[PDB]
Design a binder for this molecule. Sequence first.
Ligand SMILES: CN1CCC/C=C\CCCC(=O)Cc2c(Cl)c(O)cc(O)c2C1=O
Ligand SMILES: CN1CCC/C=C\CCCC(=O)Cc2c(Cl)c(O)cc(O)c2C1=O
Lengths: 214, 214
Amino acid sequence: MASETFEFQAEITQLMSLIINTVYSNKEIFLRELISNASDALDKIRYKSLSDPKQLETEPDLFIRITPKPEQKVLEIRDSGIGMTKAELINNLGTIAKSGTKAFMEALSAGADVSMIGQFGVGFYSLFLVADRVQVISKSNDDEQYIWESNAGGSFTVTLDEVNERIGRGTILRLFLKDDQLEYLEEKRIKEVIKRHSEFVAYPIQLVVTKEVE
Amino acid sequence: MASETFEFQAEITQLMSLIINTVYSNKEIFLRELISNASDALDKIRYKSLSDPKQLETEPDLFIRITPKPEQKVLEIRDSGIGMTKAELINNLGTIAKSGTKAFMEALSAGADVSMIGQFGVGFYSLFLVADRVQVISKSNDDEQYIWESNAGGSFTVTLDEVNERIGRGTILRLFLKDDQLEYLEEKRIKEVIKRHSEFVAYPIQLVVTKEVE
Ligand SMILES: CN1CCC/C=C\CCCC(=O)Cc2c(Cl)c(O)cc(O)c2C1=O
Ligand SMILES: CN1CCC/C=C\CCCC(=O)Cc2c(Cl)c(O)cc(O)c2C1=O
């Protein structure tokens, strides 16, 4: 119920401000970045399960699932990967200095394509190209379900999850899309972006479509 | 977190035992019954909003939404209707003697078609034709989100909801389908049942389909 507030490491806030304000054209690369991250999480739970089979029992199916929520202007990207504990959301998503953050900003100033973000290990922050707010909902086998939330400012919140659907195991990236980026709520657009940049994915990519009967 | 246990009124337990054990053929009528109930809830919030417009602001869209969850063997029927308080789930779904329950059982003994269940005002209990367990998740503007749960036995539970997605307003009927009734997880089957028995519905009926990309 009670939210804990944490400060972002200085260089991460600069990077987030850069990306949320950019007039850069090829904004669709955010999906490639989030599918790769999702695929890495799925590799980690699969690799871990080789010597610990019981790790998969909290969520036996290994998948990536994309759910547009047009009514809320939300796009969700779920995976049944390793997930993150409260301590892993705090360290990995904001407080610890990520190797590559300042160097990616340096490559960007020199002329690099924002598309290179994933080679610097900070591809997660590409979501701010299309979203002005994000909730990272995660369930690790080692902890309770938690919500990490950011709006590209200097601080983020972490809250024990008592409001969202139960994840058996994994992470949900809940993107609150910008008014000009509502095209990523469309099935044809989503399918087009997936086929173009995520051809070699070892896990099924599912698209959740809502349709009116007759 | 803590579940409260309540006893069913004697005649409701008889009716539920009757329906969960029946070898009756036309089991698909359960959907017609749940769509009518959903449509009545939607009428009640719409009628109430005529003199109280602010009632619709917790969930402005009026819809019926069917979500098969094949992995869990679950079928969900959501509406953004009036919803029920903790006291309304306890009174309306089990403790208060429903007018028509014993008379429907009397009509059934005499030879009536189970399809008549809705004319006796107890159509909700037709869900036990296809499910051996049910969770009624409901959010009224007047109360918190609660979970009513039954497996056709003599008692039901009511629990404050800290585990499911937030309903803005309305009810979710979460059916845990029987091993022989997993056909109602299929889009073609669901669409066929809706077109045959629910032609005159004033609200959009949405079907949530999950599909693997490429
Ligand atoms: C991949 N992991 C585990 C964390 C692995 C360790 C360090 C990297 C931290 C950043 C992430 O990659 C977190 C994450 C994101 Cl952003 C995602 O979009 C989907 C996921 O499923 C995860 C995740 O739960
Ligand atoms: C219609 N109401 C309000 C309760 C109205 C008063 C008395 C009747 C009680 C039984 C119901 O009909 C409850 C209900 C069911 Cl079972 C349903 O499948 C969908 C709904 O949305 C509701 C609901 O929330």
